[PDB]
Design an enzyme around this catalytic site. Structure first.
Site, PDB file in Angstrom:
ATOM      1  N   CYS A  45      11.095   6.613   1.440  1.00 60.04           N
ATOM      2  CA  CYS A  45       9.439   6.243   1.569  1.00 60.04           C
ATOM      3  C   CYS A  45       8.975   6.877   2.707  1.00 60.04           C
ATOM      4  CB  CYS A  45       9.188   4.476   1.471  1.00 60.04           C
ATOM      5  SG  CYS A  45       7.492   4.209   1.389  1.00 60.04           S
ATOM      6  N   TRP A  79      -0.112   2.169  -2.384  1.00 57.47           N
ATOM      7  CA  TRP A  79      -1.249   3.163  -2.647  1.00 57.47           C
ATOM      8  C   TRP A  79      -0.795   4.540  -2.635  1.00 57.47           C
ATOM      9  CZ3 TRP A  79      -2.237   0.268   2.078  1.00 57.47           C
ATOM     10  CH2 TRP A  79      -1.781   0.939   3.066  1.00 57.47           C
ATOM     11  N   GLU A 108       1.612  13.237  -4.768  1.00 61.35           N
ATOM     12  CA  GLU A 108       2.259  12.591  -5.720  1.00 61.35           C
ATOM     13  C   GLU A 108       1.727  13.002  -6.864  1.00 61.35           C
ATOM     14  OE1 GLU A 108       3.985   8.567  -5.063  1.00 61.35           O
ATOM     15  OE2 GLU A 108       2.593   8.431  -3.531  1.00 61.35           O
TER      16      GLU A 108
HETATM   17  C1  HEM Z   1       1.361   1.544   1.098  1.00 62.70           C
HETATM   18  C2  HEM Z   1       1.335   2.834   0.946  1.00 62.70           C
HETATM   19  C3  HEM Z   1       2.634   3.602   0.385  1.00 62.70           C
HETATM   20  C4  HEM Z   1       2.733   4.772   0.437  1.00 62.70           C
HETATM   21  C5  HEM Z   1       1.710   5.826   1.022  1.00 62.70           C
HETATM   22  C6  HEM Z   1       4.172   5.219  -0.153  1.00 62.70           C
HETATM   23  C7  HEM Z   1       4.549   6.499  -0.129  1.00 62.70           C
HETATM   24  C8  HEM Z   1       5.646   6.908  -0.733  1.00 62.70           C
HETATM   25  C9  HEM Z   1       6.024   8.323  -1.267  1.00 62.70           C
HETATM   26  C10 HEM Z   1       5.115   9.504  -1.283  1.00 62.70           C
HETATM   27  C11 HEM Z   1       7.222   8.287  -2.038  1.00 62.70           C
HETATM   28  C12 HEM Z   1       7.950   9.365  -2.662  1.00 62.70           C
HETATM   29  C13 HEM Z   1       8.380   8.720  -4.331  1.00 62.70           C
HETATM   30  C14 HEM Z   1       8.325   9.937  -5.126  1.00 62.70           C
HETATM   31  O1  HEM Z   1       8.049  11.220  -4.888  1.00 62.70           O
HETATM   32  O2  HEM Z   1       8.465   9.648  -6.367  1.00 62.70           O
HETATM   33  C15 HEM Z   1       7.802   6.894  -1.814  1.00 62.70           C
HETATM   34  C16 HEM Z   1       8.819   6.427  -2.196  1.00 62.70           C
HETATM   35  C17 HEM Z   1       9.331   5.139  -2.190  1.00 62.70           C
HETATM   36  N1  HEM Z   1       8.638   3.950  -1.571  1.00 62.70           N
HETATM   37 FE1  HEM Z   1       6.839   4.032  -0.739  1.00 62.70          FE
HETATM   38  N2  HEM Z   1       4.653   4.117  -0.404  1.00 62.70           N
HETATM   39  C18 HEM Z   1       3.901   3.232  -0.159  1.00 62.70           C
HETATM   40  C19 HEM Z   1       4.121   1.626  -0.544  1.00 62.70           C
HETATM   41  C20 HEM Z   1       5.693   1.170  -0.813  1.00 62.70           C
HETATM   42  C21 HEM Z   1       5.868  -0.043  -0.833  1.00 62.70           C
HETATM   43  C22 HEM Z   1       4.768  -1.122  -0.677  1.00 62.70           C
HETATM   44  C23 HEM Z   1       7.165  -0.078  -0.975  1.00 62.70           C
HETATM   45  C24 HEM Z   1       8.126  -1.410  -1.276  1.00 62.70           C
HETATM   46  C25 HEM Z   1       7.666  -2.508  -1.257  1.00 62.70           C
HETATM   47  C26 HEM Z   1       7.744   0.949  -1.069  1.00 62.70           C
HETATM   48  C27 HEM Z   1       8.910   1.526  -1.375  1.00 62.70           C
HETATM   49  C28 HEM Z   1       9.370   2.826  -1.796  1.00 62.70           C
HETATM   50  C29 HEM Z   1      10.852   3.231  -2.123  1.00 62.70           C
HETATM   51  C30 HEM Z   1      11.915   2.121  -2.676  1.00 62.70           C
HETATM   52  C31 HEM Z   1      10.513   4.511  -2.445  1.00 62.70           C
HETATM   53  C32 HEM Z   1      11.707   5.197  -3.153  1.00 62.70           C
HETATM   54  C33 HEM Z   1      11.345   6.260  -4.347  1.00 62.70           C
HETATM   55  C34 HEM Z   1      12.742   6.509  -5.132  1.00 62.70           C
HETATM   56  O3  HEM Z   1      13.767   6.351  -4.530  1.00 62.70           O
HETATM   57  O4  HEM Z   1      12.582   6.964  -6.187  1.00 62.70           O
HETATM   58  N3  HEM Z   1       6.694   1.963  -1.074  1.00 62.70           N
HETATM   59  N4  HEM Z   1       6.809   6.114  -1.086  1.00 62.70           N
HETATM   60  C1  LIG Z   2       5.087   1.969  -4.494  1.00 63.96           C
HETATM   61  C2  LIG Z   2       4.877   3.283  -4.352  1.00 63.96           C
HETATM   62  C3  LIG Z   2       4.052   4.055  -3.666  1.00 63.96           C
HETATM   63  C4  LIG Z   2       3.471   5.227  -3.736  1.00 63.96           C
HETATM   64  N1  LIG Z   2       2.853   5.823  -2.986  1.00 63.96           N
HETATM   65  N2  LIG Z   2       4.273   5.991  -4.917  1.00 63.96           N
HETATM   66  C5  LIG Z   2       5.068   5.206  -5.736  1.00 63.96           C
HETATM   67  C6  LIG Z   2       5.644   6.175  -6.847  1.00 63.96           C
HETATM   68  C7  LIG Z   2       7.001   6.842  -6.371  1.00 63.96           C
HETATM   69  C8  LIG Z   2       8.149   6.268  -6.661  1.00 63.96           C
HETATM   70  C9  LIG Z   2       9.035   6.731  -7.732  1.00 63.96           C
HETATM   71  C10 LIG Z   2      10.070   6.028  -8.404  1.00 63.96           C
HETATM   72  C11 LIG Z   2      10.841   6.543  -9.438  1.00 63.96           C
HETATM   73  C12 LIG Z   2      11.517   7.696  -9.048  1.00 63.96           C
HETATM   74  N3  LIG Z   2      12.007   8.565  -9.916  1.00 63.96           N
HETATM   75  C13 LIG Z   2      12.940   9.616  -9.628  1.00 63.96           C
HETATM   76  C14 LIG Z   2      13.187  10.650 -10.455  1.00 63.96           C
HETATM   77  N4  LIG Z   2      13.425  10.127 -11.756  1.00 63.96           N
HETATM   78  C15 LIG Z   2      13.915  10.981 -12.836  1.00 63.96           C
HETATM   79  C16 LIG Z   2      12.761   8.977 -12.416  1.00 63.96           C
HETATM   80  C17 LIG Z   2      12.510   7.854 -11.102  1.00 63.96           C
HETATM   81  C18 LIG Z   2      10.472   4.928  -7.437  1.00 63.96           C
HETATM   82  C19 LIG Z   2       9.932   4.509  -6.296  1.00 63.96           C
HETATM   83  F1  LIG Z   2      10.411   3.381  -5.586  1.00 63.96           F
HETATM   84  C20 LIG Z   2       8.862   5.134  -5.767  1.00 63.96           C
HETATM   85  F2  LIG Z   2       8.034   4.514  -4.799  1.00 63.96           F
HETATM   86  C21 LIG Z   2       5.426   4.190  -5.395  1.00 63.96           C
HETATM   87 CL   LIG Z   3       3.623   8.622  -9.847  1.00 66.03          CL
END
Ligand code: HEM
Ligand SMILES: Cc1cc(N)nc(CCc2cc(CCN3CCN(C)CC3)cc(F)c2F)c1
Ligand SMILES: [Cl-]
Ligand code: HEM
Ligand SMILES: Cc1cc(N)nc(CCc2cc(CCN3CCN(C)CC3)cc(F)c2F)c1
Ligand SMILES: C[C@H](O)[C@H](O)[C@H]1CNc2nc(N)[nH]c(=O)c2N1
Ligand SMILES: C[C@H](O)[C@H](O)[C@H]1CNc2nc(N)[nH]c(=O)c2N1
Ligand SMILES: [Cl-]
Ligand SMILES: [Gd]
Ligand SMILES: [Gd]
Ligand SMILES: [Gd]
Ligand SMILES: [Zn+2]
Lengths: 401, 401
Positions: free
Chosen positions: A105, A277, A282
């Site tokens: 994140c 947000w 993304e």
């Molecule tokens: C508030 C603004 C937030 C921004 C700008 C943000 C941004 C991002 C971005 C750009 C990713 C990359 C994920 C992808 O490419 O699919 C990500 C992943 C992630 N975010 Fe954040 N996020 C936000 C809020 C949160 C919140 C509120 C949570 C949990 C309470 C969170 C937990 C996570 C987790 C666990 C991932 C891991 C994604 C994965 O492993 O698939 N995020 N976030």
């Molecule tokens: C809370 C929030 C904020 C933000 N800015 N964007 C997101 C979407 C990204 C996001 C995507 C995932 C799904 C990950 N994929 C990896 C490829 N696999 C094939 C399918 C699942 C998990 C998140 F935990 C996660 F955060 C979420």
């Molecule tokens: Cl998305």
């Protein structure tokens, strides 16, 4: 302790927090697997014990009456029930820590600002649905998005799990076509087929919001349509390319990940959707330009009258930048919170600094932190990072089907 | 035990069985991934044996007369001398293999086509300079660049090293000011001050080609002015941004790395400069737009009349893409070989498939293969990769001061 260098500035820190990394990642000294997408009472006790320690460290009560009492309470609960229950403040702290610990994140500067909705009393999929609607309503907040998590009942012996089958609360349908293609979002063909199998009457647009498939313990998943007024969307237009609007492109305001498992002190919440947000890449880069997603890049480039017959024109790069501009312009025009990749990585650098002073380091997955366009234009590209797993945590988990 | 590798764009799966051979332990542990970190007597016989095995298996001559006989010859050579000399064909093989094994190299589809100049009969910096000059002129080839390595004599105890002190054979000077800041390339301020220290008169320019510092064994370094007609440079102009030429930007034709140690079968070659041709992002994105490099991004954006007041205009992204367009255009107009990041990554995917069939995998450093602009627009972004050390190899080494 790994030495960590920033190559833009030349500064050097040591990630001492990594020495506490509990669960094991996929790398060995023989080979690094960092780029991979997917990397008993006594053990429950020791996880719980560590988390309770964390919580009491946070409230400046380490080694106190309340602390040992809680440790005592949790052991006696585990011996008597095989599990234990989080106090509400421990749940709030555990959910924020899970976000704070999430290595992929980039938005983690905000980790302390998270609204935690305690739905642990949830009794059915119907009640689950109402909690989710109120989460979506609160988080969306008419476009002034607020970060939130709703925590449904924990995994427990004797009963099945609560699960949200959807990967996000808001997702667009992907319909397989008559010539093998996908209409709408190809990432969502599987959940789409499950929805139709479970009684959903499909549309046939490119931006059809999916119904929720909500699973109460030991229950088939139950279909729920989201009230259309709850789902805030943003039609996409470009500030200077007026034909862009005729693409008919849309995205939704609220990124609400609903298929991840929240782990706090060894307790597991298989259903705990969280939302924040979007970062514009993304949507503009991944969701719209990935070849295996909406895949609009070439069509945008043709429309921009770029030369798409040679790669050296950088037609892809130019069309992608304008798609990201359109996303940012459109969300700003709609007054829907969005952060561009430069601001987001800049705040993530402050996060790393805050975290270096606070905890002695910060678990970060360089390949996910660096944005998918303009990598080295952002400060995170030149930051070495240490990737490791700390608990509390958001973990992936299998699809319940 | 054989890492599953997935391509997330097509859905295809491979198993990297080649990883099982990884010799030098990398920096990662099950506890923490350090994948994004830039810089992570008769044991000579065990490496020599394995390398001789590699050579003969590669020429379908494992378990044959020449193989068995070559085994004794190296056995006997180390026995009497404590080391061994590579046969010419082996040196050729080892240099090609070291390139093939370089996980951070995206241009390894070319690994089979490499001109190896054998400089093992060398002594004195004057000979080095002649060898270096033959290399540069052959490699440059009037802009039709040809991959080449020049292998100076191996390391042996007691005798000081052959070393090229410059990180590359062509580097632009970096000059401090009445304000500490740098004129020219900040990446070379150290070697710029060392050349200046060794009797070089500094220029006033931002693109002064540095002089070479060539170190004969146990002798001090010796300055050498590179012949100006042998240093092919490209003035940077933009196809449609008439004012871009007036920025006075230039880059040289030949990327020739002269600070890495070539290891083949346990033998170490601290002086072994290799060259190929640029990928356009190296110049246009990193060299020109890194904040600690020429850092031109804002200057170009000002010239493009972009809104540098808000990050969300993506002015940085737009300026970067046009600088990369200008690099590609300028090199193509100068008829100097260059490859854009789309073509290079596409060929690298072809390389991965080839290496899968040939050797059962391919060491690849995801963070270095994925280009620094438009990462997810290239196929390597969506390709999972395994990183590990194979021999022969190019290894980093300390600065000889
Ligand atoms: C508030 C603004 C937030 C921004 C700008 C943000 C941004 C991002 C971005 C750009 C990713 C990359 C994920 C992808 O490419 O699919 C990500 C992943 C992630 N975010 Fe954040 N996020 C936000 C809020 C949160 C919140 C509120 C949570 C949990 C309470 C969170 C937990 C996570 C987790 C666990 C991932 C891991 C994604 C994965 O492993 O698939 N995020 N976030
Ligand atoms: C809370 C929030 C904020 C933000 N800015 N964007 C997101 C979407 C990204 C996001 C995507 C995932 C799904 C990950 N994929 C990896 C490829 N696999 C094939 C399918 C699942 C998990 C998140 F935990 C996660 F955060 C979420
Ligand atoms: Cl998305
Ligand atoms: C022929 C065209 C070639 C292309 C297009 C190419 C491309 C690249 C690129 C883009 C990098 C990234 C390194 C950086 O950003 O600093 C790299 C690294 C590297 N290349 Fe290649 N290269 C070529 C030729 C060669 C040759 C001929 C050799 C050796 C004989 C070689 C060996 C290496 C090594 C060892 C690295 C690792 C750099 C490091 O660790 O700092 N390359 N290459
Ligand atoms: C043959 C060839 C082709 C091509 N296209 N590009 C190159 C240059 C890449 C390259 C760069 C380096 C140096 C990388 N870091 C090291 C730390 N330093 C402080 C900043 C620069 C070493 C190489 F060994 C190397 F190869 C070479
Ligand atoms: C193969 C590679 O790990 C994969 O494409 C990753 C790379 N980095 C990423 N980074 C983010 N933020 N999101 C992603 O989905 C991915 N995908
Ligand atoms: C910290 C990070 O590993 C460092 O900035 C790396 C990232 N990827 C890179 N990739 C290439 N090709 N060249 C580089 O110098 C770097 N720098
Ligand atoms: Cl360079
Ligand atoms: Gd227009
Ligand atoms: Gd169309
Ligand atoms: Gd002007
Ligand atoms: Zn690793």
């Amino acid at each position: 302790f790994p030495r960590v260098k920033n190559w833009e500035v030349g500064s050097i820190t040591y990630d001492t927090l990594s020495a506490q990394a509990q669960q094991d990642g996929p790398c060995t000294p023989r080979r690094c697997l960092g780029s991979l997408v997917f990397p008993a009472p006594e053990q429950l006790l020791s996880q719980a014990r560590d988390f309770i320690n964390q919580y009491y460290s946070s409230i400046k009560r380490s080694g106190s009456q309340a602390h040992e009492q809680r440790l005592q309470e949790v052991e006696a609960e585990v011996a008597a029930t095989g599990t234990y229950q989080l106090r509400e403040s421990e749940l709030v702290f555990g959910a924020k820590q899970a976000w704070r610990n999430a290595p992929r994140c980039v938005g983690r500067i905000q980790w302390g600002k998270l609204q935690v909705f305690d739905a642990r009393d949830c009794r059915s999929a119907q009640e689950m649905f109402t909690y989710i609607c109120n989460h979506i309503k609160y988080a969306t907040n008419r476009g002034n998005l607020r970060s939130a998590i709703t925590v449904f009942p924990q995994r427990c012996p004797g009963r099945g799990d609560f699960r949200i089958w959807n990967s996000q609360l808001v997702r667009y349908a992907g319909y397989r076509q008559q010539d093998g293609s996908v209409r709408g979002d190809p990432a969502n063909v599987e959940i789409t087929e499950l929805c139709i199998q479970h009684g959903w009457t499909p549309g046939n647009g490119r931006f059809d919001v999916l119904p929720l498939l909500l699973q109460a313990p030991d229950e088939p998943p139950e279909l729920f349509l989201l009230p259309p007024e709850l789902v805030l969307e943003v039609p996409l237009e470009h500030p200077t390319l007026e034909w862009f609007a005729a693409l008919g492109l849309r995205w939704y305001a609220l990124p609400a990940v609903s298929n991840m498992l929240l782990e706090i002190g060894g307790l597991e919440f298989p259903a705990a959707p969280f939302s924040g947000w979007y970062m514009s890449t993304e949507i503009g880069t991944r969701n719209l330009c990935d070849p295996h997603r909406y895949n609009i890049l070439e069509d945008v480039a043709v429309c921009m009258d770029l030369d798409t017959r040679t790669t050296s024109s950088l037609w892809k790069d130019k069309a992608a930048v304008e798609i990201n501009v359109a996303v940012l312009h459109s969300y700003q025009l709609a007054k829907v919170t969005i952060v561009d990749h430069h601001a987001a990585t800049a705040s993530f650098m402050k996060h790393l600094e805050n975290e270096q002073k606070a905890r002695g380091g910060c678990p970060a997955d360089w390949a996910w932190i660096v944005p998918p366009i303009s990598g080295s234009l952002t400060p995170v590209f030149h930051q070495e990072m240490v990737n490791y797993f700390l608990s509390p945590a958001f973990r992936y988990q299998p699809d319940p089907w």
